[PDB]
Symmetry: D2
């Protein structure tokens, strides 16, 4: 006997042992008589068009693939629920937080960032940790990472960042010169880069890492009063990492290590869970905060803004069909129920357009009609119609225009957005020079110990050594600007690696 | 008070007066607070991306259209049932014919041939009369026209034919020279052309014309014995046509005449119906038949092959949403339940491939998962997986490969095809000169009376006069080959039209 | 001899009389030996899969159609040039206006608004008059109508307006209750409806109507100084309209009248031209303007803001293939060269998003690589890569990320946008009650004469009589609000029509 | 200094040192003023829709991906030429062989079979070796593997085979039970499985393996005489393999080993080349051949059917843009110029449909218009029009129907297919028990030496040990049937691996 993942077909057969096998049909539901031999003229003659059994099967085989995600393509999924344990109704009126005890169905995707569909699980990379809450006020997608921060703080740099992380447009190879020419030209990366190359760069599967919303978000209570917040979901299973040595062995021994670990845990009843907390910053703490509180390269320090618990995320169910339920999952940061709103974070503002946009391409115009994407715990009603692959009565014969004197759906005034006042020139403000070093210095000196600093520098040098000298020089200077000993250690190791 | 079609919204409201109107949401199920005013900075300021309510609705609006059908684009739809009235089980074992009294849900689409989505209903053109039977053995699509015959007898001439009937590739205008250059170069068109320019070329709506499967099909009984057949469905409302003068007034007065007629009839309880008959030819009779029994430009004469009755088609339901239920309808002549099979008709052999092919483009790869297209009275199970817009459980965790020791679906040996023997060179055989005139001569002399022949020639001359003289000459010569008086009457009229 | 349009094929043959006809190939370039007969086993045998000549052609036929435009689907195209005739360089630094005499290639499309591909030309609807300028600074799309104004002033009402103008979602019929329910609920429509139902609602083809950008736009000169402007392009051929009576005859006699008129004109050297003028409003004048200067339902009166001439638009070339050059034409109001900017017009702010969005659906992700869409008078260079149907080098091996130390494309600082100051609450402002009546009153009383007022009301009553009584009442009231006699004349005529 | 692949961007900049960098534009050719900072109201304000620079770039980023290939997704490409060295015009009349010395440009793509886009190069799998010849008679696609044979001999088992080789539909994990259940239920796989688990299962890059067409094809000379043939292209660089130990190290050290090796070889002038040979079998030898000569699990032994040389394949140019030139490469076994025809091989018959079909889904309806797919050395002329993303003049105003009196393209009678006679029942013939063991016995005993047999069984057992015991037993039995000592060595090793 072997691990439960491998006994999948064995189990599927056992769970069916009582009934007869189904009649094998065409997609049109016509039974087939023989599907191992083609309709031909004579045993050694040519194939016939009449063989629509072959055509029907081949055409669908021919159309099996859809575009992979443009980032976060390698993915593992599971299902479960969110349960409220504490009362934060004074900050948010969202139905998902309505009383202690309330459960909401969730769906989760875990991913790496750079790799395509066939890439190894145990590599140095950030991890996507996206959570879809199926609430009565519609779906809530908290599309977060394994980090509170990101490498950049304006969405116009995003496609670039990603290009620089992926393959060279001519050679189709990972290119250290791209990676570090970008990172060194944009020192705002200093904070997230430092996180990346320390121990948590390679987590031991998905169950031993935290999730963050990373963005500042806005919560709105029943009175119309607003606060800003951060979401943190901390692992109940404890932070646990892989060493470079073990991560590399597994990269060839089990490219699908995280995917297997997740499935096996759930199947053996060992159900993983997280504790959701928030931090809260009032509008008048946001004016006097020393950095830009919407800067995605900055955290809110725990000393000044402590964690306030909200509840548990629990994963207790595996997908039944991986393609249907985890490859077709779409998360839109813009799916926000009343009580939860966007901050003016430049990066989050971008993600409000990007995701529904890419989903309309990757999946299709009507991708919200795909069961796992459906807001099945809410009644969708509006004046949208048609599109390719329309799957429900399309709304019926309801009046399709608004306003109307025929009692089609009505707007709900309580669901209006919080109103903020803004003033300034409409222009492109340069954010390149928001303090890129301070929080990093703290991280280096105060969070990391002696050994961890040493490994941090070894990890960095071990990858930066493959970039050209002029690029190394500039990266080193950026690291020096955080701490002279940071730069020095890295430079001592580069001197050796250069022969 | 007006016709029922005009009162559609009125009625929708009345049927609802007892409830409160639904909450208006985004596609993600989020309630909207205001949907008449955009989120802007100040009353005369610019739009924000934060307005996801605007984007969500606009992005769907933008994706509303799908490619119209490449032919038969203008269509009217309805739903009802087929009921068996007579016993033809000695010819076919198909479940849809199993006992007298058996009802099968049907869907029907009526169409013109050449015009695009906005064209007028009451024009000279053949009419499509596609019929989908939802049987327990899977769907059966009888994709027929208002005529027993077509213009050509090889599928390689079809794209041409259609091109010649549609718009000039440069000017985007209907082009008489294309129409008649083709027809004159291909006299096999003489039969259908004579049908088209008779009174029956403009039916008074969809309720007053016949349906034909036109092709020869094959029927297989329980013993494994086969005969060849034609399907005729005759209107129970009686043949009725529009005159040229009335058809033209309606063309601007009500471009949607046949659509409104069909809807109002069903809504006022006058449900239209057809009687399904067959003609049967034994394999032996096929060998001694004077023409090619699979030549789509030929009928089987009634004297030698009388109509045997089978059933009634009844339309008693209107569609609730026209896009969902009529624009997305897909018929495949290749959806044939055991007991019905194709003949070797060159034209039908082409249709076996073309329709599923075009559907994968027009609707999409999984178009069969769209409710109206679903074989919902059959259990679909096989080794096909994935594809864009996957809508069910994607057949779950079932083993996806065949054969397997894990009890996935099995082939059903009784559903094998009838075995026929063929012998000859694999080669492209010329069918341009199969008899092109005989059956037409009969039609001209023995089916039409004196007045009808006169109108036939007037309708032909009225359209042919716009073609160049060399094209007119050649067409007239083809008409002379049927009968000298046919030719000379047309020529006398062209002499006048040419001034 | 006939009109030039109908001699198209004749002329194509004459222009080729010297050369031999090309060898007919598969799409893959393989010469075909016979394309009139299918590869079968024996003359009355079944079709083989190894007929790849058949398949290759049918598969393309099957994929001929693409989605029609979601609005303005019925269209006519031509090509030509714009020529600067007057100096407005003090207002705009745009390369297209650089010197008197300067010519720029243009592409125009003319459309109706509501009809689908097959619909008649001579119907009451607004007309599209889209101009694409191929400038050295990239493409400039002036996507305009044959009216200075529009029915609504917020883009969130757009999809609804269009739904109401189109087909009932159940009956698939034009529905007067939808049309007038909307218009009567949204009186802002009063101005444009008044235009629509007067003589100019049916132009005598495309050569006898004006064009307008409708929107307020922003112009920016070499100094960085901005002004607001309107674009009017008046016909040099003179305004000319069809009467209801002749428009209806032509709707069946020649569904393609505007198409044919334009093609024949250009083919016979009678080249239509328009004169481009602007109106200019300074930023100061914009603060004191009595209405909202960016309200799409308002004009700037000629007394206070006279027309200032700029140049000529001339159409002197017909398309060669209609599909490639006129069905695939894409216009984006967002294509604006430096010198021309958007105003804060709520309506135009929406069009900035909508068009590129729909274009990616209707044609494809890389639609801008389609010859007629290409900015071929400029050099496209950036960090965009890949996508479906990539057609040039894909920009080679050039570094694909920005910034870089490898000399890929650089930003041009002089191309930066004009900076404006805005202040106010970020919220949804109600525009429902901006002055809906004043400019219409002026239209009714001061622009129209006696006869025209009469015809205006007859035209309104002829269509409004098909709506329910409660809808009539409410519409009439909106017209009374413009002028008591306006409401009255309409009501007297409805009184008659209601028997 | 490092390898040439790593210096790609370095070299790109050098090759450009003399010019100024290009102006950065929108896709519409509009220069951009700043592309690092988003348009916002105030430095800490929300993003605007007016930022069309952001949307234009993000929208394209969002549509970057297309469906990977359904099999052979991981790939490497190069370009060069084919040169004729010997005279085989007595067998084939194709222009590509027309005289000694004749050069034809080619495109090659090397690939693995099961892995997706991100999988490792140095793994046990067959290798695709597809060659596209750009002939005057249109494209010739020789779509071959690094082996003469395949695992199955009917096309209806293909989707299954592939499913069995890829991921479990629930766990998304590679599944040994699927792999060997299939292989053990279908012993026709014995031949190719033995090849695969032997030394040549993991080639040292693409330059050190052979290519085969595998299928029997047909050749036709000027006299209309025909013979059957096999294409073998043998590496000029010599067969060279990796050991299991090294292949596994490289799988994590350089997942893109083969890609890097090819690019580096070409860049340093060391240009790889292959020698094209055929085997020839007369129609009459085909009738007496001891096996089915069209059975894809069978080879033609060299003693009886020696290699005849034809020419050289040389790869001397790297792609400039990987996506444009290698990801969008499409090969159709159905692209065959006159002089080359298909045999009746059941498998090949299915490939005639599959490839164009999948290309229409993967790339698009008009994928043959993509530069690298174009038959750019032929003149494509026919009656095919339109489709999504139509890129040329769409063949202008040419008459679009056939036949015509207007001198559009004509069929070329010399390019008719060879005519063969076939006779038999049209039915599904069972090919499951054609000899499954004879040629495999020969391979085991006569081709492998003692050491190699040892490694073969070690390789087989190392993978087969993960499958269930009943599956093991069955596979071993299939191996015993080839030779008792084959099955018995594998069983001795499985006994140990099962503890
Ligand atoms: N305040 C925050 O939200 C976080 C801050 N940081 C870093 O700590 C600095 C000071 O934060 P402050 O709140 O004042 O200090 P604290 O000491 O209160 O917080 C330390 C935090 O760092 C996280 N952490 C520990 N090791 C690593 C690592 N190797 N990689 C990434 N994260 C790690 C811990 O997460 P855990 O709870 O799992 O132990 C803990 O939340 C910041 O400048 C920032 O660099 C990092 C994460 C969160």
């Amino acid at each position: 006997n072997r691990d439960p993942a491998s006994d999948q077909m064995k189990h599927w057969k056992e769970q069916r042992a009582a009934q007869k096998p189904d009649v094998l049909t065409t997609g049109g539901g016509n039974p087939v008589g023989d599907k191992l031999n083609s309709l031909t003229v004579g045993p050694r003659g040519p194939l016939l068009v009449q063989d629509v059994v072959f055509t029907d099967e081949m055409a669908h085989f021919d159309r099996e693939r859809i575009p992979e995600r443009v980032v976060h393509a390698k993915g593992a999924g599971a299902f479960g629920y969110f349960e409220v344990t504490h009362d934060i109704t004074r900050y948010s009126k969202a139905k998902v937080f309505e009383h202690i005890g309330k459960r909401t169905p969730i769906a989760v995707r875990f991913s790496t960032v750079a790799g395509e569909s066939g890439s190894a699980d145990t590599v140095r990379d950030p991890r996507g940790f996206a959570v879809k809450f199926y609430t009565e006020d519609g779906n809530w997608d908290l599309v977060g990472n394994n980090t509170p921060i990101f490498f950049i703080r304006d969405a116009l740099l995003f496609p670039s960042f990603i290009h620089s992380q992926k393959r060279n447009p001519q050679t189709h190879l990972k290119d250290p010169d791209m990676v570090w020419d970008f990172w060194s030209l944009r020192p705002e990366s200093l904070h997230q880069v430092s996180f990346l190359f320390s121990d948590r760069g390679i987590p031991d599967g998905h169950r031993h890492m935290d999730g963050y919303g990373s963005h500042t978000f806005k919560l709105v209570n029943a009175d119309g009063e607003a606060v800003y917040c951060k979401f943190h979901y901390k692992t109940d299973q404890g932070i646990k990492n892989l060493s470079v040595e073990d991560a590399a062995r597994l990269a060839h021994e089990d490219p699908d290590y995280g995917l297997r670990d997740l499935f096996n845990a759930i199947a053996t009843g060992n159900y993983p869970s997280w504790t959701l907390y928030i931090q809260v910053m009032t509008f008048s703490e946001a004016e006097i905060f020393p950095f830009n509180p919407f800067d995605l390269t900055k955290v809110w320090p725990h000393g000044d803004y402590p964690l306030i618990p909200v509840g548990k995320l629990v994963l207790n169910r595996n997908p039944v069909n991986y393609f249907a339920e985890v490859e077709q999952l779409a998360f839109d940061p813009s799916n926000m129920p009343p009580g939860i709103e966007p901050s003016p974070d430049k990066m989050l503002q971008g993600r409000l357009f990007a995701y529904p946009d890419t989903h309309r391409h990757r999946l299709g115009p009507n991708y919200l009609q795909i069961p796992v994407n459906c807001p099945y715990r809410a009644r969708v009603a509006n004046y949208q119609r048609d599109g390719p692959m329309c799957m429900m009565d399309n709304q019926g014969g309801a009046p399709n225009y608004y306003p109307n004197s025929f009692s089609a759906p009505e707007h709900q005034p309580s669901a209006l957005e919080h109103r903020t006042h803004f003033s300034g020139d409409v222009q492109r403000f340069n954010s390149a020079n928001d303090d890129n070093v301070t929080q990093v210095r703290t991280f280096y000196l105060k969070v990391l110990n002696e050994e961890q600093r040493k490994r941090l520098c070894e990890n960095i040098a071990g990858h930066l050594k493959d970039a050209q000298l002029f690029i190394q020089k500039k990266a080193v200077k950026n690291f020096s600007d955080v701490h002279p000993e940071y730069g020095s250690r890295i430079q001592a190791l580069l001197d050796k690696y250069n022969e």
